[PDB]
Nucleic acid binder design. Structure first.
Ligand code: ZN
Length: 252
DNA sequence: GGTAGATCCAGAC
DNA sequence: GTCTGGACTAC
């Protein structure tokens, strides 16, 4: 899931778990547990705590308990569901939080790329994976000025810059490619090569593109198909090590 | 200290 | 078999 989908999860999941008390934590792929490194300590500390809130930072979910926070990233394919402890688990279920009311919060992930970190609440924001996270793309803290400052410093492509979590929180490939198309900028352009006008426009399209989604594609996944604005075949190449889509006529 | 390269996984070719 | 992707290690 990308940022908009994660925000939907935050909103919809919260009322399904708030006020429930954890009675057990079961782990079927320990590699997902990143802190404490020992999955047994992860499970033990959570027991007895009640879910009090659920926040989002970038693509991270932050579950707020009594003393601790659970920081969760779904990567490409992770998903949460709430269901009865009486029913069989769905395939690829790797972590389960069991509540005292006989319901469960289940984490599934076919690829097993997702991560979980638990810390005392007061520490979570100053430890990985939240430490160094850049500003929310929809916040005044992410400004053209901030983007400009980062762009001028680096030798990397503009795509690489936007994918950088320290620059802006949780802005993924689909939105990078779409935002760059909408801003008329080739993804392979050196970030430092962007003019003030291009930075301003890119910021505007980033906020618009992801803002629209949080509340229909031009290039992403459209290789070999006509651009919706000029009819030129959309191309796909590798940029910043990732599959990257663009129109060679609309973007410069 | 900034950056490329490496990494994890299993489904799609 | 090869390719793919979000967010330490070593040049
Ligand atoms: Zn075009």
């Amino acid at each position: 899931p990308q940022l908009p989908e994660v925000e939907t999860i935050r909103r919809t999941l919260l009322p399904l778990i708030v006020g429930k008390t954890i009675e057990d934590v079961r782990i079927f792929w320990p590699n997902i547990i990143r802190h404490p490194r020992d999955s047994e300590a992860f499970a033990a500390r959570m027991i007895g705590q009640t879910v009090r809130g659920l926040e989002r930072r970038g693509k991270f979910l932050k579950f707020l308990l009594d003393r601790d926070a659970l920081i969760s990233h779904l990567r490409m394919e992770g998903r949460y569901a709430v269901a009865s402890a009486l029913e069989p688990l769905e395939p690829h279920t790797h972590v389960v939080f069991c509540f005292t009311d006989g319901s469960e919060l289940r984490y599934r992930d076919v690829r097993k790329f997702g991560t979980m970190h638990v810390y005392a609440k007061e520490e979570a924001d100053r430890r990985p994976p939240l430490a160094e996270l850049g500003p929310e793309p929809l916040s005044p803290a992410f400004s053209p000025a901030v983007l400009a400052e980062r762009a001028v410093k680096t030798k990397r492509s503009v795509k690489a810059l936007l994918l950088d979590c320290t620059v802006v929180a949780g802005f993924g490939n689909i939105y990078v490619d779409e935002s760059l198309f909408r801003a008329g900028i080739l993804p392979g352009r050196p970030a430092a090569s962007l003019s003030s006008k291009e930075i301003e426009r890119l910021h505007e399209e980033m906020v618009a593109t992801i803002g629209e989604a949080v509340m229909h594609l031009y290039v992403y996944g459209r290789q070999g198909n006509p651009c919706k604005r000029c009819g030129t075949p959309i191309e796909k190449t590798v940029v910043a090590g990732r599959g990257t889509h663009y129109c060679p006529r609309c973007q410069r």
